[PDB]
Design a protein around this ligand. Structure first.
Ligand SMILES: [Mg+2]
Ligand SMILES: [Mg+2]
Ligand SMILES: [Mg+2]
Ligand SMILES: [Mg+2]
Ligand SMILES: [Mg+2]
Ligand SMILES: [Mg+2]
Ligand SMILES: [Mg+2]
Ligand SMILES: [Mg+2]
Ligand SMILES: [Mg+2]
Ligand SMILES: [Mg+2]
Ligand SMILES: [Mg+2]
Ligand SMILES: [Mg+2]
Ligand SMILES: [Mg+2]
Ligand SMILES: [Mg+2]
Ligand SMILES: [Mg+2]
Ligand SMILES: [Mg+2]
Ligand SMILES: [Mg+2]
Ligand SMILES: [Mg+2]
Ligand SMILES: [Mg+2]
Lengths: 93, 46, 260
RNA sequence: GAAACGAUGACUGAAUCCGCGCGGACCACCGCGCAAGGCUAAAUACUCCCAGUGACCGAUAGCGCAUAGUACCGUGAGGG
RNA sequence: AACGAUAAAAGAAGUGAGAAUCUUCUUCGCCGUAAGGACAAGGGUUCCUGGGGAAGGGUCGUCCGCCCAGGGAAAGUCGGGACCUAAGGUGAGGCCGAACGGCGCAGCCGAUGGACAGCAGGUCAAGAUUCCUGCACCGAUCAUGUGGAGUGAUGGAGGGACGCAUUACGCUAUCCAAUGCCAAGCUAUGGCUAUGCUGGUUGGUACGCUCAAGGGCGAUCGGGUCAGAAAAUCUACCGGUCACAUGCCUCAGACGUAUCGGGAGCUUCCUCGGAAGCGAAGUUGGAAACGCGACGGUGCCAAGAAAAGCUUCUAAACGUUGAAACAUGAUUGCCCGUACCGCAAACCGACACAGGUGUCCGAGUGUCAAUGCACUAAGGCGCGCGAGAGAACCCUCGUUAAGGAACUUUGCAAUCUCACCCCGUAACUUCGGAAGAAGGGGUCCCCACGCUUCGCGUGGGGCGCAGUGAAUAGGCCCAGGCGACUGUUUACCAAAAUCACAGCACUCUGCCAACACGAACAGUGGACGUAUAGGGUGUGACGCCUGCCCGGUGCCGGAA
């Protein structure tokens, strides 16, 4: 459904500083399309989406043991809206 | 000195691959023999 | 004639007229079947294509035609004659010695014994000289397509005509087979001196390799210290000189006085 | 081998109950049996696995491993 | 013993527990057809930020490609998939096979190739034909309106569509010159006071009657049915007509105007370092591609993919009052790859290895030319042990008295020789060659005259021991043996007198050919070849020639 299929919002210097261009971003579920993501994000925050991009991220640290690593494997989607802006109250982070 | 090993992804996948062991039973023989080998790792995860 | 060359390490060539380049199948080079190499060598080449060419020439019967151009194509070693028919259909045929450009060629059983015309042996005049002969009605012409070759007619039997194949072999070929008047022109290939090593390569790969160079493992003639050999035999110890490699067969009674 | 009999690969190809196969060339007696249709637990074999015990080991032993077919070697099969 | 190339380093300044090695400044030497830059394969966070100091780093270490944590990678158009096909793989049916299995038409898979819609800038510490700004373009679904009627298939046709070498013309990238234009400033050393010095000198989009080499195109009526299975207005034909040079079609690229960028620098602020604001001129002359115009021109023999998209034509079907086509907004753009290394410290080599790795770009000066040679630009780097000593010996170089091969298996090695111009050049010869034979001479600078372009010749003059002033740079000849020749070969002791080689000969083979692979009356290779062909064998350009003996052996023929 709508509320999963997008996991968690990205947090960084160049992340929420770009939250101010009306551009938001979050890690979504790796098997997803731009369309399903559009539907989801729009049906979540009630704003139409023009700008969309998405990408695919690796993994692989380790610390201890012979354990030597694992890939965690995220995906980060980035959205621009039309002049309708400011998602929820949570664009105010 | 050009070495014996000249890595090619699509090659190591064409020969040796799981899908490659599919086509014949010498390779499926290899599969089951490897499964019981201990828990080894059969070719294309490596 | 032929082309010649001043002294730069050279001899001969051939002389090719009538330029077109028209409409036919591709082909690929290879020397062997599912396994290893069967027919030895000839793995080279200039990457020729293939011109599907009519041999049998049946369905054009009763319909006349004009020679368009004469093009010189590999996989042939003959002049290819282009034909246009009254049908509107274009077709390729071989080009006999002394066929001008734009003569009239007609097929069928009624046709007149003139150059290029297709017509069965039963109609072929006594002692006449023709090429492109079928062994069997239909299929195609397996006889006299080569460099400067022809076959004449030695008599009649019942359905059969006595023909002279160009080894100088007498044979019985039934009169139900189409034939083409004249000898395949081909200039004369025996003339062309094939230049130097690699003029081979031009058409096909590295030629004869003497087993006497080889080693006991490789060929019979192999081994020894010097240049020599004893017992005279090929890949397998059959031997080349005067051993009939033929078998006892059907067409063997359709053959009369084969000698040479 | 004196080689019977079962068994088929190729040619052949009988009888049917005063009948047929056998009994180690073959014959006659004399016995024993009745082919060319099928199914049929049990007593037998084995140990991935669970339990119990041992004039079995106890860290260079005991399974390769007090867990790892991991690290590590090889293109690979494979080894370890 | 070694610390992995003899491309040297030096001082100051910083930081720190500690510095030859980390940071900064200023110099120095090195690459610069690379030792710079961009990609592919492959590697897999090695990238960036802030840390860290065990091990790894051939010393050190505050440092790193190592350790920790966080961040960073954006696509309707680029490359791939939702398109097509080559070799190959596959393969219902089908042809074989003790099994497992070997085959195989269509079809299908399969880029290395075909097809296919954007460019210009900006910038995070780290992405960019992806994000943002400016202006594009493609297909799709639909809405107003035009039109106001046919669309026009797994099928036909056209077209995709292809070689090598050489070459006329026009242009661009791009580089060069200048008492062009613009900007900044001071320059002293003896002078110059600008006529010096340094730097900068147009990219995209748009219209435009401007300029333009080059480039490719005949048009319609109709005829035969026998041709494209059928169909046809499409195509192939035989014919009639108008088209010979003018003619049509497009314009690479230049020019103008516009406009959006960029641009030497410039100003301000500075958290000690980058942010932010601004903005000049854009000339004349020359050179010039392997790129573009183009699918150009001519010649040559060995005669140079397929298939879709695409263009036209019907079959069928629905509609012929609401078609195809157009622009006019809107809506729409799915999947995967994009970081970094990528001639190497990150790929393959156990190694931070003198090795290996395919494509692209690769500046200037001097030099006949040049990707050569020397020096340099942009860019990158001095090779992760140092410092002294100046013995034998050892390696790599430099010069050498008198002699000049006396050395030695052998002139092995190392000299000499060297470029370009002129003159000149033998036996022998297959009349091509031998030949760069052999020799001899010129070479720099200034001035006048001339000339067919950079320049060149003539004359005169000047300087040095010397003027391809440094680097790149053949010693030569006389006889032979072997092979004719280019070529090929023993990955790691043999490159040859070996193999191959054109040419020549013997013989086999009538075509489901002999011959070869094969569980097989499968299939395939010979060959989509056919007896101036295809196999096997041995000789080895070319020239003169190839003798005697078949008893024995093989081979063909015969018949008591
Ligand atoms: Mg880590
Ligand atoms: Mg030998
Ligand atoms: Mg032998
Ligand atoms: Mg021998
Ligand atoms: Mg070192
Ligand atoms: Mg140095
Ligand atoms: Mg230098
Ligand atoms: Mg250390
Ligand atoms: Mg200037
Ligand atoms: Mg190093
Ligand atoms: Mg240069
Ligand atoms: Mg001396
Ligand atoms: Mg001297
Ligand atoms: Mg001596
Ligand atoms: Mg001596
Ligand atoms: Mg020497
Ligand atoms: Mg030689
Ligand atoms: Mg050697
Ligand atoms: Mg003789």
């Amino acid at each position: 459904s709508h509320y999963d299929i997008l996991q968690a919002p990205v947090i960084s210097e160049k992340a929420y500083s770009a939250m101010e261009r009306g551009v938001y971003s979050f890690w979504v579920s790796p098997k997803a399309t731009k369309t399903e993501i559009k539907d989801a994000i729009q049906q979540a925050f009630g704003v139409r989406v023009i700008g969309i991009s998405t990408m695919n991220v690796p993994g692989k640290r380790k610390r201890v043991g012979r354990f030597i690593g694992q890939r965690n494997d995220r995906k980060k989607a980035i959205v621009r809206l039309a002049e309708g802006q400011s998602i929820e109250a949570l664009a105010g982070q | 000195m050009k070495r014996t090993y000249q890595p090619n992804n699509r090659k190591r996948a064409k020969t040796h691959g799981f899908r490659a062991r599919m086509k014949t039973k010498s390779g499926r023989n290899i599969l089951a023999r490897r499964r019981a080998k201990g828990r080894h790792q059969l070719t294309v995860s490596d | 004639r032929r082309q010649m060359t001043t002294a730069d390490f050279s001899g001969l060539t051939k002389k090719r007229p009538e330029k077109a380049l028209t409409e036919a199948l591709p082909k690929t080079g290879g020397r062997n079947n599912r396994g290893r190499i069967t027919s030895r060598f000839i793995g080279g080449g200039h990457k020729r294509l293939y011109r599907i060419i009519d041999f049998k020439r049946r369905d054009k019967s009763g319909v006349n035609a004009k020679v368009a151009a004469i093009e010189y194509d590999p996989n042939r070693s003959a002049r290819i004659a282009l034909l246009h028919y009254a049908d509107g259909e274009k077709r390729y045929i071989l080009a006999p010695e002394g066929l001008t450009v734009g003569a009239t060629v007609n097929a069928g059983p009624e046709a007149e014994p003139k150059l290029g015309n297709a017509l069965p042996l039963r109609f072929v005049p006594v002692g006449a000289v023709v090429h492109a002969l079928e062994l069997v009605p239909g299929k195609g012409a397996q006889l006299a397509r080569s460099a400067g070759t022809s076959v004449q007619v030695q008599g009649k039997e019942s359905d059969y005509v006595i023909v002279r194949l160009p080894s100088g072999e007498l044979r019985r070929v039934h009169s139900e087979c189409y034939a083409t008047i004249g000898a395949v022109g081909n200039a004369e290939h025996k003339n062309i001196v094939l230049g130097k090593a690699g003029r081979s390569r031009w058409l096909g790969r590295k030629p004869h390799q003497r087993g006497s160079a080889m080693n006991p493992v490789d060929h019979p003639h192999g081994g020894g210290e010097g240049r020599t050999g004893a017992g005279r035999v090929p890949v397998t110890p059959w031997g080349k000189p005067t051993k009939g490699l033929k078998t006892r067969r059907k067409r063997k009674t359709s053959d009369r006085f084969i000698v040479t």
